[model samples]
Target: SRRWFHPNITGVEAENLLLTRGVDGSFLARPSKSNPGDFTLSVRRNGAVTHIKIQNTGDYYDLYGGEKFATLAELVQYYMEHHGQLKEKNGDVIELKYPLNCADPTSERWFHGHLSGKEAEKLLTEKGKHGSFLVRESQSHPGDFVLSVRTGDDSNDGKSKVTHVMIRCQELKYDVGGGERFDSLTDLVEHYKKNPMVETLGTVLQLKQPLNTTRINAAEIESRVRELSKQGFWEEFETLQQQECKLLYSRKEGQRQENKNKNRYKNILPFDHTRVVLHDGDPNEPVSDYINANIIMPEKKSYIATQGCLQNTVNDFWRMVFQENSRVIVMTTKEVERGKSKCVKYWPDEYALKEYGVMRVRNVKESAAHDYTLRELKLSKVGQGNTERTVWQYHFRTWPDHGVPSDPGGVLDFLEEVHHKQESIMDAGPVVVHCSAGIGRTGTFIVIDILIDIIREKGVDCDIDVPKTIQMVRSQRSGMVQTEAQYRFIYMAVQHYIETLQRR
Candidate 1:
């Protein structure tokens, strides 16, 4: 029977058509060996073969169906539409659709089914080099999935590590994974395409570390800290001093003048300088020293350590406090150290009003103790809104110049009071800490408080890597744990805290 054909399509058009859509039967278009400029479509379905020849003149006809199609798209679409009825010479019929049931023998089980990890891995191993892998959510678990991959490493090492990147699902972000966060397996798989399995496994291991809350033995901690203070402790302290100073930019002329360091040994460097919104005309002029060091961690900024307010820059210091919304001011030095003005008095005494630049500050309350003094001050801009704030000034006295406290017990006790006051405030800002240079004793005090907090929160079983903690703060603000002796004091203070915890 003669069949009329649809209008013909060029070879390029036919090749492009086949590339764009899927057909139930296997379809291939290649130049005919016998006829130059002509093309043939070799298609197979249910073990039956259908040969379609596309003439150089752009006419196509199927030999088996005795039908014609003008374009390869038309021919492929025709095959896709009627492929189900085709029978092979042996009388077997082939399914023309993707298997809907995983249990079916013809199912692409690697994509959707309960397969052993080994089987899934095998499929990934076979196909991953071509950028294909199996990623599917388990029916039992709604948010997580089993991801099969070739570890991007040697194959033997693969079976153990990259076998399955089982996402330990969480709402809270995991940090060791470069803080990349994901809510579901789909997000994780997208992330995995860029980040390899080894890195995720590293974070998984970090997440698995047990958080121990057990109280440590007081005497045991004391002995360990005491011995720690005696041995390679000072050695470790010296190690930081010997470490290269990378903050050369802070040594520039404009930045140098900001330091109140009496000696070169105590000069302060900014880890991050706060950008101020300048007003009062001539805003172009960089008015004063951005005299603040931000010691921030993952989600928390612990302190903004600054040099004691200089007589010339006291107003800017007050501006920083107001700007940062700071509530706690920890003054680690007295106004005078060795009869030199260590810090200018930034706040007034009882009932006295002190004005610095645009802000007015008054000491609303004051209380003194043997070790420290507490002052509550009301601060407000002279011409701004009725907005006023109370700042707590914790003044720790008796801490000697370039030295540790007389005993760790008294210092720890003082830290506890400051800590309690800090905790009492709702939505508190970073604690403002300062000494002669805001790096020597200031660094010591902050490090001790940090370690004490970590101990109480994570317990003695939590590894106290003091050097690592020191490095963390140093990263935020240069030269923290300033002196070797002060570094030893941090260990001693934490040791004392452990003893107190055990004593109770």
Candidate 2:
């Protein structure tokens, strides 16, 4: 079925003024491929009303030269072109730009209307006043009327970001009334220069400005102390680590201070902190600094996602555990750093195999594979897997600045290996996963793990309720996990895995 939407902007001549061509990437224009020369355009009511509006597509902070945007004309042109219908031809997609702000409330602008300051202010505060604009009819008249730029679907979010942008149309209305009003904004501005009362109360209709990002509240240290307890019974776990190795798991303030020297660069850029929101695969703790740890649960099971940033955060977190709480010092290893000779001698304890702790048996010695079969020797197994170690690794590869998660596969792969290893541990205890400012990536890992468990237990046909799972996890663990994106991933992952299985 063929369908078309009426241009929100009314006049054909005025609508054409907003168009420009490709390659220049300058002087933005609204162009449509449809050849609507003479035929009466058939409107499709089934889809939605075409809105002649544009919203800021860039992030809140993409301002250039200390200016959000300069001229009204530039703003109009740029906005009209950014997002519209995308057309695919020869396997490539091209978005078509269309008219903006052309419908009802605006009709009064090109024409004339009557409304007072009292009347205009009421429109400004209306609940759905986004793409709305006010226009005065006659520039010559002091208070003839105003034009409210509003479309039928202006209140709908997808239809328009704004309900209107009003201009004083009293002048136009007065002029149309013959020497009683002004025709354009120029006439209104001139009159405002002459008479100041209109400028003070009527002309400037205060608007609700866009909100800026809030400063994350600083966390209490006492709260953090409590967090470590829930993550793992550090005192009990530390005893386990100590019993295995003769190394004293003491809170050596001296060693902690010594470790501080190693907090410099690690040949790569590091992570930073961000705010916390609720959802699955959402970060529990705030991400304001590079390194911070807060315990987050993946599901009802005992598994946890311990996340934070590099250097100081991770080391300080362990320092709090091993030194303050006397817990087994958890550590992580990168693939590149394994088995390579380096002058950077780590912790003096040789048994403190930071690299070996997180290594999967299949990844390490695939040929020997003793770790896989060593499981038959239950008591002899030290890690959680057949290898008998609580494979400690990063919750994610690297955190992004905007707090977006990487592909969900790596997390699932790591956790799947974790579940496999946990199955083998005769004494399979708890697994530790951390990144800088734990929540985002940590929540991501936890969700993927939970989904994997659900998939395994329920079979491919199972319908697991994600909202219930997230709420269930959050109730027991505060700041446990939350995020809209992460919750959305539940369906995404299931759909992806399910489709892949079907293809197989």
Candidate 3:
């Protein structure tokens, strides 16, 4: 096996390597045989030692070349602060901002770690929390924790009582069946290490959609359908369709149960934008580059979603996601001009009618236009009071609302229906949702969909954090169901759903 290099530069590239500054304003690099500890390396020309360290955690494999620096400021400007790892050799610094570890082709940070000096200390000092005499900084980028030896007894015992208070406002720890709870933020990290199930706890999301489980591919399915139409292979075609349907349902069934486990690395999951495909040559990018190893990718079966989300991009994301047909649900807020009152009503169900799916409203009179010429039909109403929570009375024939996430009863409404239908060989189908271009509506719906799944399975005992769950979905789906307003609406909708479930 080739020994990892100290300055780890290849060929003639060693001479021009960029340098960074240490806390004390020195250029740094890994000296020969140096054990991945934090250190300050210097260059005589620049008059500063660069603050560089090896990614002791097995997660990081990239090597930094030996570089020089003058001041920590110049080093930061030229390298460390933004691109390379930044660690303080001293103990007093509280807050430190480093880069994130993970990389999303479409996201800004791209799998980097940003930590505070104190937080780095905790991750470095904490023994037994990660590995014995080794502490794992729970980050998407498993490398990059500022190291400091815990002197005295704590170091000797090989136990770092060092509290991992590295909690971000948007990030939280996830439990397998339910999320793990901690008394303090520190307890969260401590318990995270102790938990036996945490394999690689970082913001590591992957293609959550299932790959091609069905024997049928786009070419095969299209060919078979066309052939059947010509040669009258109805029985043969029907048999093939049944076989394909069986495969599709089996895949989805596995996926529904698979989402039950806890995922607490990077809270935000990245995703592909709805209603558009990514262009390789243009500024656009696909969501495939940023997925973690755990999440399931969508397929082109009855259960897969095909709401034209990948139509804009020429990338293979669609093929990677199996070119599945998605069932879209569009939700919007429409203003009713009843004289001067001008009432704004929620339009999730109405949007469904624009496609061709059936409506499952709660209560209210069913209204149908006698003239079939009137394409938009009002089906049924789900009313909370006289104001009416919703009027689920539309039937869009092709697909449901492509990107809509909110309705009268929130996710519970959709989950119950979907689960019941998907119980056997039933593929409730890929849910395509959108508001306008599909970001807002799509994100909101997906959040609710997963939340409802968690709640239904665990009930009150389910240890899921609503916000964290949303963040996790975002990490998998990329600014899932995009837009701040859409996120806020999902929040309200989830709150209402939980309260309603509790009341029942």
Q: Supply candidate 2's per-residue lDDT for 123.
A: 51
Alpha carbon lDDT of each predicted model? 0.55, 0.32, 0.30
- Which candidate number has the best TM-score? 1
lDDT of 1 by residue, 1-504 (tens): 001111133445444443444354445544443453355554444444344555422112333323433233333434445655534446554333321110111112123334556666565554343234564444555544555544333235433333455544456321223356754333444455565445433523111111111123433556656555554553444334333232222323323443433222222345433323223422554444445445445124377766777676687778778876788899888898768787888889887888887888989888988888899898888887685888899998888664567588878878898888888888787888888656667767888888788777777666566766776676665555544467667777887788677778
lDDT of 2: 0.32
TM-score per prediction, in order, is 0.53, 0.31, 0.30
TM-score quality measure for candidate 1? 0.53
Worst ten in a row by lDDT for model 3: 102-111
Looking at candidate 1, the ten consecutive residues that score lowest on lDDT are 99-108
lDDT of 3 by residue, 1-504 (tens): 001112233222222332232233323233222342222233213332233332211111122342322112223333433433432354222122332111111111111134444654543453222332222234543422211122223233643333232233224332223465433233433354354232254421221111111222221333433543552332221212112111111112112222212111112112233222212222342223221111323212121221222222212222212222222223321222123211122222323432111222222333343211111223232221332122122221221222233443534454444444334323323443322222233445555666556556666444444344544443333333332234444545555666676688
Error of 3 at 25 (Å): 28
Tens-digit per-residue lDDT, 1-504, candidate 2: 000122232434332433321121112222122321111211112222212222211111112211122112223333344543222223322333332222222211122244444454455445324433444443354444443433224333455332233333441332322243544443543343354222233343222221111111112222323443462222221212111112112212212432333322211111111111112211442331222223334543444334333333433333323212211212222212335321122221322334322221222211112111111111112244443322322222232333244454444444556566555545433344433222334444555567657667766655454434554444322222333334444444544555445577
User: For residue 186, what is the lDDT in candidate 3?
Assistant: 30
